[PDB]
Design a protein around this nucleic acid. Sequence first.
DNA 1: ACTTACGGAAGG
DNA 2: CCTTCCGTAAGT
Length: 869
Amino acid sequence: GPTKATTTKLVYQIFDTFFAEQIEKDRCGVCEVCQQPECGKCKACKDMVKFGGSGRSKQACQERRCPNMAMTLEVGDCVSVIPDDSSKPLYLARVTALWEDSSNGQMFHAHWFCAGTDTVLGATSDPLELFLVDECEDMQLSYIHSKVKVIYKAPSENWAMEGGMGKTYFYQLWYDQDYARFESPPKTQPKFCVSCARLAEMRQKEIPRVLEQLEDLDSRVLYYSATKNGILYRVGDGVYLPPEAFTFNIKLPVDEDLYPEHYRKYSDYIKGSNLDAPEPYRIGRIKEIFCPKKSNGRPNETDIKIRVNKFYRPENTHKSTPASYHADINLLYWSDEEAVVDFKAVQGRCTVEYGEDLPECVQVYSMGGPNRFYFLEAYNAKSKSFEDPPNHARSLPKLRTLDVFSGCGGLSEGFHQAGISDTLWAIEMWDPAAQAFRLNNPGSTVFTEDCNILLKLVMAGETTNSRGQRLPQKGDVEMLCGGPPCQGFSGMNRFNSRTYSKFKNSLVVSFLSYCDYYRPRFFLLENVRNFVSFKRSMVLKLTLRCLVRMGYQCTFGVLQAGQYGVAQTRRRAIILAAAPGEKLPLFPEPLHVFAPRACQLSVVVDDKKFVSNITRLSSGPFRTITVRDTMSDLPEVRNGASALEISYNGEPQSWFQRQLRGAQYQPILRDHICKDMSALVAARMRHIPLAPGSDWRDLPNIEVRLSDGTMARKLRYTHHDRKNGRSSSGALRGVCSCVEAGKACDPAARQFNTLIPWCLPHTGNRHNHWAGLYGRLEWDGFFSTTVTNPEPMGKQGRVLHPEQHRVVSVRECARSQGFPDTYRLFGNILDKHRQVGNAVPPPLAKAIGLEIKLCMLAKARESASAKIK
DNA sequence: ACTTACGGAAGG
DNA sequence: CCTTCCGTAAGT
Ligand SMILES: Nc1ncnc2c1ncn2[C@@H]1O[C@H](CSCC[C@H](N)C(=O)O)[C@@H](O)[C@H]1O
Ligand SMILES: [Zn+2]
Ligand SMILES: [Zn+2]
Ligand SMILES: [Zn+2]
Ligand SMILES: [Zn+2]
């Protein structure tokens, strides 16, 4: 069975009543009733201090009875402000100024606090915690109800060792409401409202301004540089532009008885289709920044314009989008075509280098930093040719990381190639995943052990495990990464209310107890997207509450993995936490353009929408990775492949394949092995057409001679489906007595050995017609979310090869996840598929790791600048 | 060990 | 109304 969650007392007292039967024991507060705010109307609410009462009586609100219970004024001090309607609680403010405004009366400047019940924490927060917000306004002194004592609960100097342990308002963190960020209080140097200073610094970062005038002309004036959103651009720099900023000179009835299920295809929406993905950014080289002169004879310093030399992508030339198949993802062509755009349109700065002018090689230059492009040739669109460009065209220590619920190590691998971490410890109960981690991380300690048992060992002074493996003590772990089991949070689990999924979900508590005990600098929790909305977003709320209770800067978000370099839709919830002395990391900007339907990443918690700090919504520097970029070089293999190590009959064909294979010649291809489906499943896969969007619904209703001694029989429609109606020939469409609403199934309408699987028309009407089951991938599209078992009749069943009559291999699944072709998997084909489908795609972990590297560099620079004072 | 039959909430 | 998609019990 499953063990109970090991807890510190801090985490226990928060997750107490939620996992009442799952955490090891030694007003529930979490029900839907205990989560709504106080009413404000009743004589109970108007007697607690939040609404301007006495408070001598407790008298809980008369809507929050849990169904699980038994039954002078001087600047610098904080005050209460009563709003119009009394049902909203007292607004807590700080006095930043106390001027006497003539003609208006006594006045002051209120810098607002945010109560904990007004944040993403909701009712989970304690009624005394406050949060700093950039919210101020001038109010009359007629509004002060009373003077409030507010304390600044700072983290101690031994905060990193406080894992394991009145009635005045306190605060520790600043709150950003748009992104639900909890950060340290901003160090702002001196009225002096802090919110006013921060908003004034923000408003003078929004405004683009030209700098260092270059040459004065009659109708305009050139400038050498400009600045926008804190980014400085000069003449000759590369700029990102929206795909609409300029243009290129290159001119851009079935047989319903043969196919009785084809009628269920009436949406025309194709899973994994890239026909609606946007174009990547336009790339320009700034030839001149200029401002037009007003009628007064001097420049308009707000109408900043830039002239730009256009760059072509290989898919922008006359040739075709096939030109993008083998080309580099950051390869361009120089053009002598120019375009004038506005400075407000620029989406960022890039680097466009002439290829054979570089001191490095273009392969080492391309991996050096972000936004790096190169070109070798100039494109002539009027003659549709390529020449060489003209002359005016040329010219920290690693964190010590503990990975809990490691698996095969996709998150650790992504963090390792980001250069930020050194995974020294891994906890992985499942033995094949632990062996894969040992094969991919020869210098780590993998604990093949339950995380609860190991945490209970380390919270006592045991210092070593049974096999004699040195456990990590507090002080060893600078980074704690992990993805706890998602099986109880997934939207595919239809038994998520049973003890199995309860004990799956209780491992988030174990992970948070690791975070509490070890107090690392950085903490990463990864889960499926449904982690943020499971059980009314209460697990997310309680996790963020635990984090802010420890004293952590924390933030949550959702990231689409395909926006970072994989041909796969995979939306994942990410929780980032930083110790009080750190910078809270930002989530990474999308690198590749991805299908807009796969990019819904906002999170609604308690009827409030939270986004991430991401700004790249539509476009991006790079083009989408496709199925052909992923597996167009893997040789032909058959259903039920068993040969582990085979040959690469050829070289890589796309940029993605060169990235995943490398440059050193390795003619060994491992794990291009497919599941061995039965004869009926094989005949079904044989009869799925090759056209895109093909799935079980264009199966033929014929009898087929299987490979074994069996004839797959014909599906019979024995009942009338009053919702689907009848076919053109008058044939029925129901397969069980369930089709008549208000009737039970019949244990005689179940039909076996059919080419069309009976269960799919049986329950298709309430399951989106099982769209995608026995579905093929298209070469121009992307994968669907790679799960631990590619099953053509699974909930995610779009796993058929584009051309071959089989299921995607282990190599193709690892490539849809962004795993290097040298990454080691272990066990039988099911173990390998499970390792691959459980992992975090290494490109996503690499983007997040670079965002953590930013904060590590920032802290190091701040230490240096405070050391040479 | 293998194969199938398949609930319901959230977000657009 | 349609689409999502780290999968689970139960049968065999
Ligand atoms: N109680 C527990 N103790 C230790 N490991 C556990 C566990 N429960 C589940 N696991 C492991 O957690 C793993 C899933 S997380 C593994 C994938 C990881 N996100 C990655 O990027 O590679 C599974 O392999 C499972 O064996
Ligand atoms: Zn009340
Ligand atoms: Zn309750
Ligand atoms: Zn102010
Ligand atoms: Zn039925």
